[model samples]
Target: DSRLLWDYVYQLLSDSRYENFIRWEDKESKIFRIVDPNGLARLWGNHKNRTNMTYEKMSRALRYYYKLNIIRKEPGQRLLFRFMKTPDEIMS
Candidate 1:
């Protein structure tokens, strides 16, 4: 389900259509930043096929991921995300 969130995000990195929406802040470290937060959320909604999904709802989902110790923000940047593990790690 939502566990595949990173899979989609990772895949989107190679898809130019959504390139402006998100990009790697540090690709080597699996750190990413949402360059266009609203766009990214809309893409997330589209990816999930949820017509009613909004950035607010998507943000709540990310917060849940945070409590699970999977995604984290930097010392100050709110929209930047650090992945705790690669999709391969999470899927395995």
Candidate 2:
């Protein structure tokens, strides 16, 4: 189920529709960033009726993933990131 959510976000990377919110920096390298970091986070709030979902809360969640090695921030000062493992690997 956790992978399912990541899979959804992963879907956006391949879909041009969410390019404004998130996208790949290098297809070959699998680099990505949250151009609109709040877009996805806000949705998480909306889904839970947390009208006042602070970005802080969402960010903490991201850090949680980092602790578990599910994902990690790209080597830079940006909203950029890259999955530590591939989706196929995730499914397994």
Candidate 3:
């Protein structure tokens, strides 16, 4: 499940980076957007329930991000989903 991968990434994001790697700007200012998308896609990409997931699982994941303040949706504005906190962000 993505939740398992997410937990791993969350731990890496929270504990591994040596610098100010938990800030937003540092996440995007670099080249690759290092984050949990890989883990997420891996879990959801070929999921047997993905068709139903379009509404159910996807929405739930989106809500989770929203609740975490990891994404922002504004009126008449493009939705933004940011997953990394800094440039030094990494995974093991």
In candidate 1, which residue pairs clash?
A: none
Write candidate 3's Cα lDDT for 1-92 as tens digits: 33443443344445556123221333433211234433444445444344333334554665675675544343332222355333234222
Worst-scoring 10-residue span by lDDT in model 2: 1-10
Instruction: Give the Cα-based TM-score of candidate 1 against the true structure.
Output: 0.83
lDDT of 2 by residue, 1-92 (tens): 53344666687788999898788887777778888877877766765566877668877877877887778889875888878778788777
Candidate 1: global Cα-lDDT?
0.77
Indicate the worst ten consecutive residues by lDDT in candidate 3: 18-27
TM-scores for every candidate against the unseen true structure:
0.83, 0.77, 0.32
Instruction: Score each candidate by Cα lDDT.
Output: 0.77, 0.76, 0.40
Highest TM-score against the true fold, candidate: 1
lDDT of 1 by residue, 1-92 (tens): 45367677778776767768887777888788778878878878887787987888888888887887777876547688888976767767
- Higher-TM-score candidate among 2 and 3? 2
TM-score of 3: 0.32
